[PDB]
From a paper:
A perchloric-acid-soluble protein (PSP) named Tv-PSP1 was previously reported in T. vaginalis. We previously reported a perchloric-acid-soluble protein (PSP) from T. vaginalis named Tv-PSP1; this protein has a trimeric structure and may possess a putative ribonuclease function, although additional evidence suggests conflicting results due to the purification process with derivatization with chlorine. The L-PSP protein family possesses different biological functions and possible activity as a ribonuclease. The Tv-PSP1 protein from T. vaginalis is capable of binding stem-loop structures from RNAm.
We found the recombinant Tv-PSP1 structure, determined with X-ray crystallography, showed unusual thermal stability of the quaternary structure, associated with a disulfide bridge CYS76-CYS104. Each monomer of the asymmetric unit is part of one trimer formed by the same monomers from different asymmetric units. With respect to monomer folding, Tv-PSP1 maintains an antiparallel/parallel mixed beta sheet in order 123645, with two alpha helixes on one side, and the trimers form with closely packed beta sheets. We determined all structures through crystallographic studies: two of them (Tv-PSP1 A and B) have a single disulfide bond (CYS76-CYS104) with different B factors; another two (Tv-PSP1 C and D) have no evidence of any disulfide bond; and the last structure (Tv-PSP1 D) has a partial subunit due to its high vibrational motion state. Monomers C and D, with broken disulfide bridges, have high thermal stability (high average B factors) with respect to monomers A and B, which each contain a partial disulfide bridge. In the disulfide bridge, we observed a differential occupancy between A and B monomers with a tendency toward the A (75%) conformation, although the functional meaning of this is unclear. In other L-PSP1 proteins, the central area of the trimers contains a reduced cavity. These data suggest that the disulfide bridge does not function to maintain the trimer/fold protein, so may be a functional characteristic of Tv-PSP1. The structures show a potential second disulfide bridge between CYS18 and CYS101 from different monomers of the same trimer, which did not formed but are in close contact; this requires further studies to determine.
Author numbering:
A (entry chain D), B (entry chain D), C (entry chain D): 19 to 28, 60 to 76, 120 to 124
Write the structure that this text describes.
Amino acid sequence: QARLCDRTLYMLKAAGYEKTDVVKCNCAIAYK
Amino acid sequence: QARLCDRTLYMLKAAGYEKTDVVKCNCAIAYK
Amino acid sequence: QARLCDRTLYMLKAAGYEKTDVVKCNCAIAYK
């Protein structure tokens, strides 16, 4: 599914993130 | 357009970067 | 070929990594 490396996440709330933390969506990567 | 997360940028000079700072180009990501 | 930016690598053993360090494979990015 998803993978959190340091501050960057390669589900959002599952790892403590929210879509105000996503930084890119391929048509994701979240960061905080 | 572009998005700078810590040291990594997901325009270059707009955010203080130059192409000697890009690290990948999908056919970008800059880092310093 | 490959490019190591801080903790993130955009060959594995060439830069001191192993596939237990890869975090994404586009069909790579390693991290430690």
